[PDB]
Design brief:
The complex is a heterotrimer, with one copy of chain A and two copies of chain B. Chain A is an all-alpha fold. Chain A contains 14 helices and no strands. Chain A folds into two domains: 140 residues, Globin-like (Orthogonal Bundle), CATH 1.10.490.10; 141 residues, Orthogonal Bundle (Globin-like). Chain B is mainly α. Chain B has a single domain, classed as Globin-like (Orthogonal Bundle), CATH 1.10.490. Helix content of chain B is 69%, strand content 0%. Chain B has seven helices and no strands. In chain B, helix 6 packs antiparallel against helix 7. The relative contact order of chain B is 0.18. The chains are: A mainly alpha, B mainly alpha. At the A-B interface, helix 9, helix 13 and helix 14 of A face helix 2, helix 3, helix 6 and helix 7 of B. The complex binds protoporphyrin IX containing FE (4 copies). The site of one protoporphyrin IX containing FE has 17 residues of chain A, from helix 3, helix 5, helix 6 and helix 7. The PDB classes it as oxygen storage/transport.
Chain lengths: 282, 146, 146
Amino acid sequence: MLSPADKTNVKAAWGKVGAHAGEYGAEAWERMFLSFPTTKTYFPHFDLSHGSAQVKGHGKKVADALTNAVAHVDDMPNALSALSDLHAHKLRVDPVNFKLLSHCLLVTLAAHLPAEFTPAVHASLDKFLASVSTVLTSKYRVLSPADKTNVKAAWGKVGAHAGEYGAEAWERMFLSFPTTKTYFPHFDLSHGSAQVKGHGKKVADALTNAVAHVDDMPNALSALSDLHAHKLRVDPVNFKLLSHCLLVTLAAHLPAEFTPAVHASLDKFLASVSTVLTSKYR
Amino acid sequence: MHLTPEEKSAVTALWGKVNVDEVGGEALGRLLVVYPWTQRFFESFGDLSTPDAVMGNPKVKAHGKKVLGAFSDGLAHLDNLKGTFATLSELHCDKLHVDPENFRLLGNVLVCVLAHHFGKEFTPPVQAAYQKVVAGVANALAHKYH
Amino acid sequence: MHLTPEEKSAVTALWGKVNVDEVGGEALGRLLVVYPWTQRFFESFGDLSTPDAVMGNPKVKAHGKKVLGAFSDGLAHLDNLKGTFATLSELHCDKLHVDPENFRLLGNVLVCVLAHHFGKEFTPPVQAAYQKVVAGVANALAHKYH
Ligand code: HEM
Ligand code: HEM
Ligand code: HEM
Ligand code: HEM
């Protein structure tokens, strides 16, 4: 995820943070609780009053973990292995909150490091915090053999309808989430549109290819990865909306096959596909 | 909450056929299986280790029924979701400490379950109407958070 | 858009110290650098090949001035963001085809720029106030999307 120049900027920025990591860490959490009050639901056992020893201590633990991460940027999943376990199995924090903390850590850094917080270093830091968040949420639920079994079973039954289901998924998405239509100003989006049919089929075919190469997805989708990142430039948030509408389409067509277990495996599979397709964006 | 006449007719019409009991247990169970971190609120429900355990758990079925029963009542007051859910909103914040992002997840799971149950009858325009409704309910439940 | 009197005063007090042209150039440039997919709208602006080229691009700075001036004007109508931005909303949807997620990214980049610009004066409660306002602006700009 991180280029070596990225790693250079983070180490330069964090070193300068230095012995202030603790106080900056506490400030970041205080900013989050105030700006995003829903995050307080994970701390009902804390005194969240300003300057609270619990917040100060928590901030210092969190900053140290980030220092450890900066120190081993080339091996983050192993360095944060324990913390990964802890968040996935015990704390069980919804992944959306990680983006909120990352944003407040950036605001904190910005307010304290005027000289250092250049546009390039800003970018690198945002990428680094996203990578940390990814590692910390990586064991929450990549595809186990049972998942891969469930996906191939489900997609096999799709079979020769894969095209028509793909069109339906897109149609469902444009109607349910109208903001996605901004990427298609050059299409007729009316029901039955042959443009939507052709697009849906191409997308479906691409997913068939991913299923076939489920163990080697980054290479099989590499070209599509390049296309979305550097030409189409679709905001990553939209991939979750299409994934949901694919799930709904499958559920509507596979009464027997869409069990809770297969539902979970499909959701994981579509999230991995989405991760691959946005991997080269930055 | 504003819907078009077409949207409201579709939502109310399909809901008349929903057995809230059966759909509610299905919806909560799939939430716990597909997004297992949500199990953090239900430690007292017993055995949640496998999908088969979750889906057949009596506490899960019972709670699902309660949750969708309240959802059902909200469907009778689409024009005023914030007013309808204010008390439950305060409860989920102050007593239960539930991250409102969970309301969004359940919303989407419920749409999947309706598609699974009703098949082709759950058409794209019908789904769009339900997506507006579950977003409206989630926002209403999150409204009194502080 | 509902703020407390304190929150509104803190927002306006700091904004009086803002050089809008400068900060607009800064915020748009950092958006294009930090989230490069947003460059898709601006291929007619010329060279965006490196951060310095973006930050130094005259077309970028000019757009940044235009955008933050309308934001600035909006701060005088906090009680009516939706009405103030209705026509801008229709234009960004029907003509400019801008995914409203971009408005949220710009809001967050702007908050960072204000922190960089004002340092310790950009306190946690002042940031909280600005976070409500940029969400309010993003929501109002997305309101007429269809
Ligand atoms: C950059 C992201 C994060 C890092 C590096 C991180 C790291 C840590 C660390 C090091 C601990 C303490 C472990 C110990 O006791 O030794 C911890 C605890 C905890 N974290 Fe995370 N965390 C992150 C994000 C989050 C987010 C986004 C939330 C919730 C909004 C969260 C909530 C918690 C909770 C509730 C605890 C336990 C507090 C206690 O009772 O002491 N974490 N975290
Ligand atoms: C599972 C996720 C996705 C996959 C596998 C996928 C795949 C594809 C494929 C195979 C193509 C055609 C490339 C060619 O012409 O050879 C394509 C094009 C395109 N994709 Fe994606 N896509 C995904 C998600 C999205 C999302 C979420 C959006 C936007 C809401 C999007 C927007 C587009 C656009 C704008 C085009 C070009 C259409 C045209 O003008 O022909 N994609 N995608
Ligand atoms: C459609 C959204 C929802 C509605 C309308 C709803 C409604 C309700 C109602 C009516 C109760 C009954 C409490 C009582 O009898 O005093 C309740 C409690 C509760 N809800 Fe919610 N709920 C929703 C979503 C959720 C979600 C998604 C979660 C967490 C993942 C959740 C967690 C809880 C918990 C933990 C309780 C208490 C259970 C107990 O007493 O053991 N709720 N809910
Ligand atoms: C604070 C949020 C924003 C406000 C208040 C705003 C406002 C404006 C204004 C006042 C115009 C001029 C329209 C006219 O000439 O009638 C404009 C145009 C435009 N905006 Fe937005 N904008 C915002 C966000 C964005 C973002 C984030 C993007 C895309 C990344 C964007 C892309 C554009 C484009 C491409 C144009 C037209 C360029 C031209 O014709 O020269 N806007 N914006």
